[PDB]
Amino acid sequence: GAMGSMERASLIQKAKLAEQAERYEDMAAFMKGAVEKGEELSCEERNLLSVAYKNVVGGQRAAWRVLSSIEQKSNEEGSEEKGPEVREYREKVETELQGVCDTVLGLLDSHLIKEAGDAESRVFYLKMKGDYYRYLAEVATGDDKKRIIDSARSAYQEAMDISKKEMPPTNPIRLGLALNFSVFHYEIANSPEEAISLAKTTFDEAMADLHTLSEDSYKDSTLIMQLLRDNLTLWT
């Protein structure tokens, strides 16, 4: 641990600074250090962890898609041979992306998930587990693609089961989980009907519970409901 000599509170402070500076690689490293102190994370701290890695992997995924598209174009008929460089560089980015996913999955397995007893924390971490297996699935092409997909599905399903038992239908973690699991169904599992059903049922059950909410909670929940609607519009 490069961060082993730094105070937990200092790591969290610096993660917040890194976020303000849009230094997401630094933010992720600080948050990894904080997790490795061994104490459970607060809600705010869980958010910092998720924001940091979402931004790092998001950039990698975008780069990977650019390179994969160039590669695919190079393998079409009439395309002039340009040697191994496009494949090599796509592989480089892919390997870095896989590394980040493995790091996050590692933190969740050692030992965030096992120590998370409250619904809000356990669902949050299981959603992350699904998400990072989904990112691995996006780039998987070999013997293990099926197992990676199943790992994502299993994590999302456990999260769904807990969220349905323990959280109201407007809870933003529950909504965001459903949003992402729906995307998993559409983009990864080749199950667009399941994706659409999940998004619709989630949206409608949330709609029915909005009346229970404060203005601020209403804002939070409706934001994510709109994302569900946006996907439905894209898919139908």
């Binding site: 998400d131 949003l179 992402n180 995307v183 983009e187 994302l227 946006d230 996907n231 894209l234 898919w235």
Partner: peptide, 5 residues
């Protein structure tokens, strides 16, 4: 890209 959070 469909939306995720």
């Amino acid at each position: 890209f469909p939306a995720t959070v």
